[PDB]
UniProtKB/Swiss-Prot annotation:
Amino-acid positions noted as binding [4Fe-4S] cluster in the UniProt annotation, renumbered to this chain: 82, 169, 255
UniProt keyword annotation of Transferase present: yes
Reaction equation(s) it catalyzes: iminosuccinate + dihydroxyacetone phosphate = quinolinate + phosphate + 2 H2O + H(+)
This protein's encoding gene: nadA
Organism: Pyrococcus horikoshii (strain ATCC 700860 / DSM 12428 / JCM 9974 / NBRC 100139 / OT-3)
Protein name as it appears in the record: Quinolinate synthase
Highest taxon, organism lineage: Archaea
List of residues binding iminosuccinate: 20, 37, 108-110, 125, 195-197, 212
Listed GO CC annotations: cytoplasm
Pathway: Cofactor biosynthesis; NAD(+) biosynthesis; quinolinate from iminoaspartate: step 1/1
InterPro entries in UniProt: NadA, NadA_sf, Quinolinate_synth_type2
Length: 298
């Protein structure tokens, strides 16, 4: 009975479980808070727990550690990684920063703490449009996702410099126009939730374009949705709105890094206090300054 033992160990450790929307259904059923990365980290800043067990990928647990340095942030598996965030290196930021020294370095939250030390302001897939448009410069260095960069470039009108060149998410890259055509034929009455990390030609056929947190907010606008993101988001939406109907655009659209977290290693995470996520004091200083600047900009 892992559920019973995890709940006991969670109490004995004075811990709180934070799970991303892409986590397995069994993981979400035992989580205290569920949402996207920045929300989960921002919800922990008002909470007294000694330990944070972050059911998510590496950069998410890092962000929680930067915003909660007084807590022990545990990751159940060091293999829970984001393939897109690891594509962006500091050699890529310093390169574009040499040719555009007046362009601010805007980095997606899906990035390493080391990369955030060179960023002037972080952004999520929910506030990227307003933050970039509120910036003083017309040139913006944006990464690592080039598909989100295209969406921000199309909404703000400012020329976006994507960094790196081929930075993208392989999960949301799976969605093609044939998946859009297949959805409209299987569910003709359903609207289309499409994540901004999808390719632009898929974005332009969406009913709404929003992050997983935005999909939850704007789900009330219709009773039937086809979800173009990680498949485990469908379970999250079904638990929140049981009266509505949700369908995955692709069942094979799954994140290996997210699936590295199971109910077993969460139990072992609380038992052995592993694996601790630490961020250099140096790096957490500048990375937090970019996050707090994002929060001051909504
Ligand atoms: N972009 C989000 C998750 C991810 O990229 O893994 C989100 O929840 O908005
Ligand atoms: S889905 Fe794409 S972006 Fe979100 S975590 Fe898995 S890999 Fe990184």
């Amino acid at each position: 009975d892992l559920v019973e033992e995890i709940l006991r160990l969670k109490e004995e450790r004075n811990a709180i479980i934070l799970a991303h929307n892409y986590q397995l259904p069994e993981v979400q059923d035992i989580a205290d808070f569920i949402g996207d990365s920045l929300e989960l980290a921002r919800r922990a800043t008002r909470v007294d727990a000694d330990v944070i067990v972050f059911a998510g990928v590496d950069f998410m647990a890092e962000t929680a550690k930067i915003l909660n340095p007084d807590k022990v942030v545990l990751i159940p598996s060091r293999e829970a990684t984001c393939a897109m965030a690891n594509m962006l290196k500091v050699e890529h930021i310093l390169e574009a920063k040499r040719k555009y020294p007046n362009a601010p370095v805007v980095l997606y939250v899906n990035s390493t703490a080391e990369a955030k030390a060179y960023a002037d302001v972080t952004v999520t897939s929910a506030n990227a449009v307003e933050v970039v448009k509120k910036l003083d410069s017309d040139v913006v260095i944006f990464g690592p996702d080039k598909n989100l960069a295209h969406y921000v470039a199309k909404m703000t009108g400012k020329k976006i410099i994507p960094v790196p060149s081929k930075g993208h998410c392989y999960v949301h890259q799976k969605f093609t126009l044939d998946d859009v055509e297949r959805a409209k034929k299987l569910h003709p009455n359903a609207k289309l939730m499409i994540h901004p990390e999808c390719i632009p030609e898929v974005q332009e056929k969406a009913d709404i374009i929003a992050s997983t947190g935005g999909m939850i907010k704007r789900a009330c606008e219709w009773d039937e949705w086809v979800v173009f993101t990680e498949r485990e988001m469908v379970y999250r939406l079904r638990k929140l709105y049981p009266q509505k109907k949700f369908y995955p655009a692709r069942e094979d659209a799954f994140c290996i890094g997210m699936k590295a977290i199971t109910l077993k290693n969460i139990y072992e995470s609380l038992k052995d206090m592993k694996y601790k996520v630490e961020v250099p004091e140096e790096i957490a200083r500048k990375a937090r300054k970019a996050i707090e600047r994002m929060l001051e900009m909504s």
